[PDB]
Design a protein around this nucleic acid. Structure first.
Ligand code: MG
Lengths: 105, 94, 195, 49
RNA sequence: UCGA
DNA sequence: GCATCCGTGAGTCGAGGGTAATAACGGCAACGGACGGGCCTTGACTGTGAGGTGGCTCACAAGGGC
DNA sequence: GCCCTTGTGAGCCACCTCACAGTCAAGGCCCGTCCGTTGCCGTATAATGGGAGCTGTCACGGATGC
C-alpha cells in the first residue's frame, strides 16, 4: 500500500494528455491534472465532452505522459482544458453548460 | 486553471515565451536543487503527505509562482550562457 | 529440489532466510567470513541434515553455506511443516548440535598433526570420500583442511608433507589418500563424531 | 495491440493537434524519445530512473 | 468482421 | 479545338481469431563439418625455509570463604 | 579451622608472517583424419508457338489523337 502513496507523490502537479479519435481539431487532445481513482475506467469532465464530441455509450480515450519539464510546461500552460474555453474557429465558447445543466438552470 | 495564468499571459507578448521561461527556470531549479529559489520560506509551495506538509517536488509550479512574484528577470541576450552557468554553479554548487 | 556445484553457495549471510533446506546428496559446509578475509569452517552438513536453520527463528541468514561436492538439496517452507516434520527437524538439529559440539572439542584437542589426522579420518566417513586401487581417499584442498583444523594452509601443507615422508598418506590434485588407517588413528587419539 | 503489450498509435491528426497547440517539445518527445530513437529512449529511461 |  | 485513355486518390483510433502444396537419378569427387587428441595459456594448488614469539610447561606458599 | 582459587618467572617448541618457486588441471586452438553431405555430369526412339483471364465506382489532371 505504500507504493500507491508513492504514486500519489510522483504525479503531484503533473498533468496527462487525453485524446479521442477522430481528432478533428486541437481540442481533440487536452491536458488534465490526474486524480487517482479505483476502478479500470478513465473519468472525463462533462464540459469538455463537446470539444471531443465525446459521449459515454462506450467511447474510449488514450492517455499520454509528457516526460520533460518543457513538455510538462507546454501541457500545463498551452494544452490545459481550463485555459482553452473558446473555439479557435468561431471565437465562441466551446466549454459551456449543456444537457442536464441547461435543463436544471 | 493554473493560478494567475491571466497575469502570467500578461507578462509576455507570446504565451510560448511564458512556456519557455517557465520550463527553463524549472530546469535551473532542478539542476541546482531548489537552493537558488527567489521564494521565501513562507512562500514555498507545499504538498500534503501522510506525514504532513513537505516541499513541493514539482519544479514547474515553483517556476510559475516565482514568475508571479516578479523577482525573476527574463529576456533575450541578457548574458552569455557559459558565464551564467558558471556563476550559478559558483553561487549554488552541485 | 535443487542441485548445486562444488564451491557454489546455497545462501549468503545477511540474506533473507525465507527457505529451510535439507541436504539430500553430497556434502555442505556452514562457514563464516571475517573482514580480514579468513574463512572458517563452522560445521559439516551431511545428507539428511537440515540447514539454513535461521529460517526457523530469524529474518536473515547469519552464516554462509557452501557446497563441497555436487549436491542435491530440498527446499522447504518452515510454516508448512506437520508434527512429523517438526519431529525430524528437532531430532536432526539435536544430532547436529552433538556433532558441532564434538567438532568444537576436536578443534581444541591435540596438536595440528593430530587434528589433521582426525579431520582426514572424519572426511573418510563423508560423501567427500571414495575409493580406488591406491586405497581410500578424500577430495579436499589444503585450504579447506586449514579452515577445518584451526590453522592456516602453509602449516597444514607442512604436516601433510611430513606424513608423505612418513608414508601415512599421499596427495595429488586436491585428493588425499589415507594409506595407513591404524597410524592415523593413533595420531588422532580420539575420533570425531561422523553422525 | 494489448496482446503484444503495444503502445498507442500517435497518428497524423494527433500530430496536427500538437502542432496547433504549438507544443514542440511534446511533439518531439512523441516523434523521438517515446518511439524509434534508440539511444534517446535508453538515455531517457535511465535519466528518469 | 467488429467498437466509437 | 474536344473525345479518350491512363494513373492516382478515396477519415481516425482501438479489438480479437487463421496459415500450405507439390513426380526423376545414379556414378564420382571433394569440400566442409563432426570428432578424437596433443600442444598451450593461465588458474588453482603443492612443498619449502627462514625468522620471530606466543602461551603451554612446571613447581612454589598462602589469602578469604563457608 | 579447613578447602577454592591465585601470582610469579624462566625456558624452550611448535605454530604463524613473508616470499617463491615448481606442479597438476581445464577450457581453447589447431591439426588432420575421416566421414557425410554437396556440386556436376550424363540420360541418344521421337519429341519443336502459353495459359488464365474477371467483370456493379468515380471524379480530376494531364497526354494524346482527329
Ligand atoms: Mg459514442
Amino acid at each position: 500500500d505504500e507504493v500507491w502513496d508513492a504514486l500519489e507523490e510522483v504525479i503531484h502537479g503533473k498533468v496527462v494528455l487525453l485524446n479521442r479519435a477522430p481528432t478533428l481539431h486541437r481540442l481533440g487532445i487536452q491536458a488534465f491534472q490526474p486524480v487517482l481513482v479505483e476502478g479500470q475506467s478513465i473519468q472525463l469532465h462533462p464540459l469538455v465532452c463537446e470539444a471531443f464530441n465525446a459521449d459515454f455509450d462506450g467511447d474510449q480515450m488514450a492517455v499520454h505522459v509528457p516526460l520533460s519539464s518543457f513538455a510538462q510546461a507546454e501541457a500545463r500552460i498551452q494544452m490545459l482544458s481550463a485555459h482553452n474555453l473558446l473555439s479557435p474557429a468561431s471565437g465562441e465558447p466551446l466549454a459551456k453548460p449543456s444537457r442536464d445543466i441547461i435543463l436544471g438552470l | 486553471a493554473e493560478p494567475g495564468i491571466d497575469k502570467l499571459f500578461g507578462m509576455v507578448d507570446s504565451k510560448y515565451r511564458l512556456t519557455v521561461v517557465v520550463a527553463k527556470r524549472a530546469q535551473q531549479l532542478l539542476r541546482h536543487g531548489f537552493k537558488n529559489t527567489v521564494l521565501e520560506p513562507e512562500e514555498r509551495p507545499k504538498m500534503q503527505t501522510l506525514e504532513g506538509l513537505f516541499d513541493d517536488p514539482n519544479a514547474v509550479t515553483w517556476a510559475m509562482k516565482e514568475l508571479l512574484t516578479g523577482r525573476l528577470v527574463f529576456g533575450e541576450n541578457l548574458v552569455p550562457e557559459d558565464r551564467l552557468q558558471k556563476e550559478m554553479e559558483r553561487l549554488y554548487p552541485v | 529440489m535443487k542441485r548445486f556445484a562444488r564451491k557454489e553457495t546455497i545462501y549468503l549471510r545477511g540474506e533473507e532466510a525465507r527457505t529451510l533446506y535439507r541436504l539430500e546428496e553430497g556434502l555442505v559446509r556452514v562457514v563464516e567470513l571475517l573482514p580480514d578475509g579468513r574463512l572458517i569452517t563452522l560445521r559439516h552438513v551431511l545428507p539428511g541434515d537440515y540447514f539454513g536453520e535461521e529460517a526457523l527463528e530469524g529474518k536473515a541468514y547469519r552464516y554462509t553455506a557452501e557446497a563441497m561436492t555436487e549436491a542435491v538439496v530440498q527446499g522447504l517452507e518452515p510454516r508448512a511443516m506437520d508434527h512429523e516434520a517438526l519431529h525430524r527437524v528437532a531430532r536432526n538439529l539435536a544430532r547436529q548440535m552433538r556433532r558441532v559440539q564434538a567438532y568444537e572439542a576436536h578443534l581444541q584437542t591435540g596438536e595440528l598433526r593430530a587434528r589433521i589426522a582426525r579431520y582426514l579420518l572424519f572426511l573418510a566417513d563423508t560423501p567427500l570420500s571414495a575409493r580406488d586401487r591406491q586405497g581410500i581417499y578424500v577430495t579436499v584442498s589444503h585450504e579447506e583442511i586449514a579452515d577445518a583444523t584451526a590453522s592456516i594452509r602453509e602449516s597444514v601443507s607442512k604436516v601433510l608433507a611430513d606424513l608423505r615422508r612418513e608414508g601415512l598418506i599421499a596427495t595429488a590434485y586436491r585428493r588425499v589418500y589415507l594409506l595407513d588407517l591404524a597410524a592415523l588413528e593413533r595420531e588422532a587419539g580420539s575420533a570425531l563424531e561422523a553422525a | 495491440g494489448k496482446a503484444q503489450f503495444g503502445g498507442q498509435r500517435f497518428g497524423e491528426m494527433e500530430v496536427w493537434a500538437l502542432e496547433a497547440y504549438g507544443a514542440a517539445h511534446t511533439l518531439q518527445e512523441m516523434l523521438t524519445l517515446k518511439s524509434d530513437d534508440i539511444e534517446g529512449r535508453n538515455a531517457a529511461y535511465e535519466a528518469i530512473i
